[PDB]
A paper describes a structure:
There are two monomers in the asymmetric unit. The electron density clearly shows the existence of xylose and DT. In the complex, the amide group of Gln529 rotates about 40 degree to form hydrogen bonds to the side-chain OH of Ser466 and the O7 atom of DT. The side-chains of Asp109, Arg174, Lys207, His208, and Asp300 stabilize the xylose by forming hydrogen bonds. Compared with the free enzyme, the only prominent conformational changes in the overall structure upon XDT binding is the movement of loop Ile222-Gln229 with the longest distance of 2.5 Å. The hydrophobic environment, contributed by Leu220, Ile222, Ile224, Val227, Ile232, Phe324, Leu325, Ala327, Leu328, Ile379, Thr383, and Ala447 form the hydrophobic wall of DT binding pocket.
Therefore, the β-xylosidase catalyzing the removal of xylosyl from XDT would play a prominent role in reducing both of the resource waste and pollution to environment. Here we present the crystal structures of LXYL-P1-2 and its complex with XDT. Each monomer comprises three domains as some GH3 members. Sequence alignment of LXYL-P1-2 indicates that Asp300 and Glu529 might act as the catalytic nucleophile and the acid/base residues, respectively.
Numbering used by the authors:
A (entry chain A), B (entry chain A): 48 to 803
Write the structure that this text describes.
Amino acid sequence: QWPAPLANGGKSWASAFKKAKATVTEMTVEELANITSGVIGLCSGVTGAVTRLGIPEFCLQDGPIGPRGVHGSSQFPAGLTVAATWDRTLMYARARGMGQEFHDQGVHLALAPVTGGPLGRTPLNGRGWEGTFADPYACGEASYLSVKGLTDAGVATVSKHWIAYEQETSRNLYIDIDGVSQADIQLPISSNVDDLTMHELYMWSFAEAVRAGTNHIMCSYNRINNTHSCSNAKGLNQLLKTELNFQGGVVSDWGGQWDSVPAAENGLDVAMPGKGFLGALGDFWGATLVELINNGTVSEDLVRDKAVRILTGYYYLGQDTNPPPPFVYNTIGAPTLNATSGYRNVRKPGTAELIKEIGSASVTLLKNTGSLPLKHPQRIAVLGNDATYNVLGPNACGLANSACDIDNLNGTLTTGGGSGSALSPYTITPLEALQKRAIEDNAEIAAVVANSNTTTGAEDAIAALLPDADVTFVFLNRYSEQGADAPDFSLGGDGDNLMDLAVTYSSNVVVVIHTTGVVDIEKWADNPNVTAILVAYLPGQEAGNSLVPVLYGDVAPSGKLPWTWGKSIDDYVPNGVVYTDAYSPQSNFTEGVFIDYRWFDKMGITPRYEFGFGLSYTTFTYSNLIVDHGRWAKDYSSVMETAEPFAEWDGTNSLYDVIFTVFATITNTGNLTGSEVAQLYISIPGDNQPVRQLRGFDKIKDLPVGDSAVVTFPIRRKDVSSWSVVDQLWYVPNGDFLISVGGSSRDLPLNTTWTP
Amino acid sequence: QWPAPLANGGKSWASAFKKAKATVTEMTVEELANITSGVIGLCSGVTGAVTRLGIPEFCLQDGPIGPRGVHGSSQFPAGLTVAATWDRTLMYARARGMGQEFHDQGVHLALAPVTGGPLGRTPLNGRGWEGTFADPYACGEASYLSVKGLTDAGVATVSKHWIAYEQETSRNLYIDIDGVSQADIQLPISSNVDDLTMHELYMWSFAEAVRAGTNHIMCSYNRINNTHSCSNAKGLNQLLKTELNFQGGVVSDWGGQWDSVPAAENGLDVAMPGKGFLGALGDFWGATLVELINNGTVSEDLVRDKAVRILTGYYYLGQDTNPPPPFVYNTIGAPTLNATSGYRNVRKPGTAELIKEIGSASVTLLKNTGSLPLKHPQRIAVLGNDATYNVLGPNACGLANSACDIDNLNGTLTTGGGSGSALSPYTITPLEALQKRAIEDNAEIAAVVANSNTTTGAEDAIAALLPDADVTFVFLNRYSEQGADAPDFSLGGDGDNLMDLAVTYSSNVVVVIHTTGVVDIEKWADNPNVTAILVAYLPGQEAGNSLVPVLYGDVAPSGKLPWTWGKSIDDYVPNGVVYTDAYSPQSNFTEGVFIDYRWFDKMGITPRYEFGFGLSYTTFTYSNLIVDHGRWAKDYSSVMETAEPFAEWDGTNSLYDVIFTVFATITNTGNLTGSEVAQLYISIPGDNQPVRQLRGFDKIKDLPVGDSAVVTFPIRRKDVSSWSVVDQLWYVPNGDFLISVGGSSRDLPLNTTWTP
Ligand SMILES: *[C@@H]1O[C@H](CO)[C@@H](O[C@@H]2O[C@H](CO)[C@@H](O[C@@H]3O[C@H](CO[C@H]4O[C@H](CO)[C@@H](O)[C@H](O[C@H]5O[C@H](CO)[C@@H](O)[C@H](O)[C@@H]5O)[C@@H]4O)[C@@H](O)[C@H](O[C@H]4O[C@H](CO)[C@@H](O)[C@H](O)[C@@H]4O[C@H]4O[C@H](CO)[C@@H](O)[C@H](O)[C@@H]4O)[C@@H]3O)[C@H](O)[C@H]2NC(C)=O)[C@H](O)[C@H]1NC(C)=O
Ligand SMILES: *[C@@H]1O[C@H](CO)[C@@H](O[C@@H]2O[C@H](CO)[C@@H](O[C@@H]3O[C@H](CO[C@H]4O[C@H](CO)[C@@H](O)[C@H](O[C@H]5O[C@H](CO)[C@@H](O)[C@H](O)[C@@H]5O)[C@@H]4O)[C@@H](O)[C@H](O[C@H]4O[C@H](CO)[C@@H](O)[C@H](O)[C@@H]4O[C@H]4O[C@H](CO)[C@@H](O)[C@H](O)[C@@H]4O)[C@@H]3O)[C@H](O)[C@H]2NC(C)=O)[C@H](O)[C@H]1NC(C)=O
Ligand SMILES: CC(=O)O[C@@]12CO[C@@H]1C[C@H](O)[C@@]1(C)C(=O)[C@H](O)C3=C(C)[C@@H](OC(=O)[C@H](O)[C@@H](NC(=O)c4ccccc4)c4ccccc4)C[C@@](O)([C@@H](OC(=O)c4ccccc4)[C@H]21)C3(C)C
Ligand SMILES: CC(=O)O[C@@]12CO[C@@H]1C[C@H](O)[C@@]1(C)C(=O)[C@H](O)C3=C(C)[C@@H](OC(=O)[C@H](O)[C@@H](NC(=O)c4ccccc4)c4ccccc4)C[C@@](O)([C@@H](OC(=O)c4ccccc4)[C@H]21)C3(C)C
Ligand SMILES: *[C@@H]1O[C@H](CO)[C@@H](O[C@@H]2O[C@H](CO)[C@@H](O[C@@H]3O[C@H](CO[C@H]4O[C@H](CO)[C@@H](O)[C@H](O)[C@@H]4O)[C@@H](O)[C@H](O)[C@@H]3O)[C@H](O)[C@H]2NC(C)=O)[C@H](O)[C@H]1NC(C)=O
Ligand SMILES: *[C@@H]1O[C@H](CO)[C@@H](O[C@@H]2O[C@H](CO)[C@@H](O[C@@H]3O[C@H](CO[C@H]4O[C@H](CO)[C@@H](O)[C@H](O)[C@@H]4O)[C@@H](O)[C@H](O)[C@@H]3O)[C@H](O)[C@H]2NC(C)=O)[C@H](O)[C@H]1NC(C)=O
Ligand SMILES: *[C@@H]1O[C@H](CO)[C@@H](O[C@@H]2O[C@H](CO)[C@@H](O[C@H]3O[C@H](CO)[C@@H](O)[C@H](O)[C@@H]3O)[C@H](O)[C@H]2NC(C)=O)[C@H](O)[C@H]1NC(C)=O
Ligand SMILES: *[C@@H]1O[C@H](CO)[C@@H](O[C@@H]2O[C@H](CO)[C@@H](O[C@H]3O[C@H](CO)[C@@H](O)[C@H](O)[C@@H]3O)[C@H](O)[C@H]2NC(C)=O)[C@H](O)[C@H]1NC(C)=O
Ligand SMILES: *[C@@H]1O[C@H](CO)[C@@H](O)[C@H](O)[C@H]1NC(C)=O
Ligand SMILES: *[C@@H]1O[C@H](CO)[C@@H](O)[C@H](O)[C@H]1NC(C)=O
Ligand SMILES: *[C@@H]1O[C@H](CO)[C@@H](O)[C@H](O)[C@H]1NC(C)=O
Ligand SMILES: O[C@@H]1[C@@H](O)[C@H](O)OC[C@H]1O
Ligand SMILES: O[C@@H]1[C@@H](O)[C@H](O)OC[C@H]1O
């Protein structure tokens, strides 16, 4: 085994550690078992109180778009959607806003963000949308800022899911309900991950989360090399708590804990949900952990270290001197918990405008043949239930946005299904917003929003409506959800039918896709009747009013794709989702570090739309690439430090030191003002190395016609490193490094060589 | 027989008559038959050209809300809806706006307004909504202003339908299509109307239409005393063309003409639609009328008088010196007419705001227990497909708003079905408008707009949503249409179910009814969970934005009911709709003059909501009734004059002279500013006379709290007259007249006696 290292508070939590140790020193064995296992309450999870010492219950609450199952709050855009902005300021402000609302609702610990698990090995991942980029570097940057935004608002974070949690299928949470136990059916999928892949690929974003000060981390459902993540000594005690120097608590996912003793010894700190959800998801600690200590199987001091880890967050964020107000909403639901809900409104001035701005900044133009931007069209047709409201109400699908019937017309896809969803005070529909703009132009506008296959008359309505239209907007979607992967890339609902009808009857079709990921558009993407295609991802509540200004040219589109859009699912990493009824299911990560565009680049597969692709209404020319070797600096700014070994280590040094900076220049060479995401890729020399790896991005805002601006990329030591499996450390390999800059992963007009 | 009197141009058309006679004098027999029978074209009806003399084809076009089947136009509110405003200025401006759009689309003759047929003998009349009030006096005033507004814009009018056209059922238009002829199935319903009833009840509004200068009149489908209206000598040659002194043309309804010779001799002028609609609706004139003249059966001079009547309008409105532009839309439809459509936009600045104002002025508050006006509710539920768009598009139901399937979710009922409908450039939905106001108050709002009986989950969505709501808006409707009467008072669609669910789960339910007439609300109107009830009638395109300001108190509601709302259909005139398969179906108008509230008042039946009932957010006190006998004046202002005989006639005199004026005073005695419709009723002494008869209305706008204003009622000679069947003239009977003033037909705090 790898022994459990003791918390010491590290960099920023030293004083809070000290108060945590003082309190925990006073605790009895019953009290230690109480704080470390869940109890019944209104939140996703609730830690027992330590009543005698005045430590209250902590509310742990979903989710990564804001607190789930609460009224009086805003529905923020999904992580996928903010990734697609490529705007650091928006990644932070989104998180800070979510945090404000978490705090004002009474949440102590936010079950957020998703910071690298699932990272994106398969594009069918039913919950991939909760994360950000299918790229370690960019996911790392988003994860850093998301964590910082949440904690800066006074909410502790529980970053998730550690680690190699890359498929929902056979995730097999522990559950024992009505005589049928998952242990007797099938064990969780095992992620079989080589050491290099674990370091260079899956750990990257978690390192950034630890550096940003995440207070906790949640261990996933999957197994790793046939050992449960939540009792994987190598995972938690070694890689997380030793190499990453993590100082906070490891919280089990809900049914992630499979056992009592291995869990306490191998790095687990908090058993969730404990007595919540009827005890059906395992209840391995609590009174049972009291007996394990008193009879000497589990070390008392070991358990005190778990308590210390939990309380460090409490004191660091000042939840003692500034308590959160009470959490008033039943987010569990009857009959599981019968208990009434109060009411509180926490929506602040500015939040609706921020959510709108994220939408306008993310929406991504994949195809424009000249129909966009719109001028002042006079006869406008609109097709698709995605254009309008859920017919049962925007929250009809319930507490996790997953309970409406398989055929329901859910309206605009504003968030995905599951624990990462949230309620919505309203939906600004695409149709409401297009209609407002139509009225200003004295135009007419009509929408067919029924099911084009199963409602009588819809097809003929469509036939009758489209030919005369100046433009036809088609709104498509693809719902996906926690607990299943998507079967394939197929549009949800009547999507395919809408598109076949649309091109039969209109030669100016503009397609807008609200989705949790990549969809199959192969039948029509090259039809010249589809004059424009845009993906708007998951925009939360301001869906229509964020889209329409971009469509009409008020602001040029500036979003780019945060993953690869291949022409077929066969173009990706093989065995993305393993289906088997084998009792011990296996997923071998044979691809290694080569996921998403790294796979495409290495096998020479040409995607339909590459990673980092997006059109504007203008063009940008790249020039004057400069590598400034003299432009280096100490890492002073992190909240916490890791202990990742590296070759050049000398006591005063860091893996996150900036060792040089790359500069380049962009010129708007088109006819309209626009923003541009500049991207930097490095080819690190070695055996079996990716052709190139994203190591920088910078977004210039609203570059006027003919103007220029400089983009700037700080390069850290780690960014040019490789991990030595033989030596067990990060090193900068000798050799020629290629540095590329440009507008996508495949449009890189500038390059240069750098040698250390 | 009653011989056909010759046109002479009467009062305002004298010079146009002269030019008409000159032109017609030059016409051959072929040319006379061409102008007097319909030909194929893009409009509802088209008169043949007289090519040699440069007289083009005239476009006749539906309908009484504006030109039908046209893009580029606005959907105005229905006549029912403007009646409910009780605002003369709005009745005029609505008509003038409709006229502008008629003209700018190229229409020569508008098939509008509905000016007393159907007037409202039965509240089940499928097309009652096209007219205004179920009251001769008020229908007369609306009819005068509607006609004036249309002609003032340069469009000739064809006022309809003459006369005693009081049920759609067995209207039996002539049609002979695919070997099956209506003549071999069933004759039109016969209206058996006594002479007093015809004069005091059905003729009243047509007299006002003739006085306002209607250029034509359309004869109805029904028979009168077992003679078709369109060949009823007594109807057309005598009552219309002699007593009413009508100087314009009688146009057949479409399939209203049953014969060639009786029609030419008994007063018909224009055979419509002629060769249009495949000749299937009879084609009795045209080439056949050429042979009838040349072989001497039909007098040539008689036919010249028809031509003269048609051309008088053309010259009077200046359609020669200012031609209408071309009519560019196929309003017939393929396969009946295959022909392409151009495009023109005629929507002017100001029209959308006028249609909104009519909505805000008409919406009628029937019940308010204190829930209205709304303050700033934070959780708002909305129920009903009426709250949102037609799922197939607002115009999906086609050229006459009547072709969507029996179950379709048609969305907000903005106009009724049939030839009196029109297309809509958009629908401002109740839900869009409530949502905008919710957003301003930082509130949440959710709508269940599916079918609550047949869509899975809707009922539970409803159960789950309503209890927590501060207010629940329920939107109900009742579509009806030309060519059928309503079976009963039942809400359309899932109405009944919505209301049962609403009161189970909310104690603050506010009901809004969009309808073509009275509906059965008896199950819930007295439930204290229904805290407010409003009828909004048919608001055209600005449905939501006209309603919401009234709901939120920006303006107090000031509409009142234009018909009686009885508790059951058994409370009305019996035999309202006769159903039979008898070849010659009969309707005996045994009730005489006693329709609508005259029936209720006479039989001592207490309606649920009386004629002229509506609540405000304030109250008004009535005081200081004055009859000013000295306040009389000559009738100088009419466009045309009738020749109605009357006892006091002396050459310089008129039946429309004002013989006194009634004044009264209203004081706003509540807490909020509001508008008030003041109503005047006279009890004319006689045998079998109504208890009281509306003879005045005046609307005070925005009366501040504690302020007073005077309402003024001019009383004409005709207004205190009766018709002598023995003498065949109007007379003022000797005796005591009761004069009542107040806020409804049953809330009349002021009264006084007047003797001639
Ligand atoms: C899930 O399972 C996979 C299953 O394999 C696990 O992965 C393994 O992870 C361990 C670390 O826990 C690796 O152990 C290290 O192995 C080094 C030798 O590697 C070479 O030999 C092995 C065995 O014959 C091969 O498998 C390797 O091949 C792979 O890597 C190469 C190189 O890139 C590729 O080309 C191959 O194709 C494979 O991908 C190698 O050829 C070994 O040197 C290393 O030794 C040090 O580290 C430990 C500390 O843990 C010390 O105890 C030991 O004393 C050595 O440390 C001293 O020495 C160095 C100097 O040499 C100093 O710098 C130190 O500070 C110190 O004083 C270590 O044992 C194993 O190789 C790796 N396998 C693969 C295939 O990746 C996952 O960890 C497992 N995960 C979980 C979560 O359970
Ligand atoms: C659909 O059918 C109904 C079926 O009846 C038709 O109605 C009738 O309409 C005609 C007019 O075209 C009426 O004719 C007039 O009758 C007068 C006599 O009426 C009394 O007797 C008759 C017959 O016995 C009764 O039916 C009447 O009863 C009804 O009215 C009374 C009174 O209120 C009620 O109490 C009853 O219960 C009934 O409702 C009466 O008791 C008759 O005097 C009148 O005579 C003059 O008019 C014509 C001009 O058309 C002259 O030719 C004639 O010379 C008289 O005119 C001179 O005399 C007067 C002075 O007396 C002068 O002032 C004149 O200027 C002139 O020099 C006339 O014949 C008939 O009564 C009426 N029936 C009913 C039941 O209403 C509908 O018209 C028909 N409609 C259509 C469209 O086809
Ligand atoms: C299994 C699971 O994930 O359950 C939890 C409760 O904590 C878990 C975390 C999860 O995020 C949470 C909160 C969610 O938010 C999910 O979005 C969520 C799910 C993914 C879903 O999960 C499932 O459908 C399970 O696969 C499903 N499992 C089974 O039917 C099953 C039974 C025996 C052996 C193996 C499987 C299940 C359905 C309904 C109740 C319990 C279990 C249950 C669950 O009801 C929700 O489940 C419960 O609320 C619940 C669980 C146990 C008892 C009572 C209630 C779900 C929702 C909200 C729909
Ligand atoms: C019967 C009738 O009212 O037809 C007209 C055409 O001029 C009439 C006036 C009417 O206002 C007009 C324009 C309308 O606008 C109506 O809203 C309207 C109707 C009320 C409707 O009328 C009916 O449904 C008839 O009762 C119906 N009648 C019969 O089926 C019938 C056949 C034989 C004997 C007795 C009855 C019918 C349906 C479809 C085509 C022709 C007749 C036809 C009609 O298609 C529309 O009809 C046609 O367009 C049409 C008529 C004949 C031949 C070809 C087309 C209708 C619409 C638009 C739906
Ligand atoms: C509107 O949103 C709805 C949710 O709020 C969407 O419904 C969900 O959609 C997904 C598919 O996209 C379904 O997931 C699959 O469903 C089945 C499992 O169903 C049952 O099968 C057996 C029963 O014998 C049993 O094993 C299961 O427990 C289920 O009872 C499988 O095909 C897949 O494995 C996968 O889980 C959801 O089931 C469905 N939810 C519900 C509650 O029906 C809906 O698709 C949205 N509308 C549109 C157009 O996208
Ligand atoms: C949405 O608006 C729709 C129209 O655009 C509404 O559909 C119409 O609604 C009325 C009833 O409210 C129906 O009128 C009745 O229908 C039938 C006649 O149907 C057939 O019966 C025989 C066939 O064997 C034949 O004689 C007829 O020609 C018909 O084929 C009778 O019950 C009545 O006499 C009456 O005419 C319309 O038929 C219906 N239109 C269509 C095209 O189906 C719809 O109701 C609206 N939705 C809601 C919720 O109100
Ligand atoms: C272990 O955890 C238990 C569950 O959290 C804990 O119990 C709970 O104690 C809290 C206070 O710490 C109580 O909360 C409220 O109760 C009283 C009235 O009874 C109020 O005056 C207070 O304001 C307070 O809000 C809970 O009632 C109680 N919950 C349950 C389910 O019993 C135990 O105390 C913990 N045990 C140890 C050893 O600390
Ligand atoms: C009786 O009515 C007929 C139908 O309206 C009428 O015919 C039509 O005549 C018009 C002009 O009055 C023609 O309109 C266009 O034709 C020529 C080109 O062919 C253009 O140069 C002109 O600009 C004009 O717009 C119609 O083509 C014609 N319609 C049909 C169906 O024949 C007869 O002329 C009328 N008969 C009499 C005796 O007047
Ligand atoms: C310690 O406690 C656990 C849980 O009750 C029990 O299974 C185990 O056998 C105990 N050890 C001894 C030595 O009794
Ligand atoms: C494009 O639309 C036109 C109608 O606008 C249609 O006739 C043509 O077949 C369509 N083209 C394709 C490739 O579907
Ligand atoms: C009114 O609503 C309440 C719930 O708000 C319900 O319990 C009660 O039965 C309802 N009353 C009626 C008369 O339906
Ligand atoms: O937040 C948790 C989610 O990430 C996990 O997968 O399911 C349990 C949830 O409550
Ligand atoms: O306008 C006409 C309408 O009033 C009549 O009833 O049907 C024929 C229509 O075209």
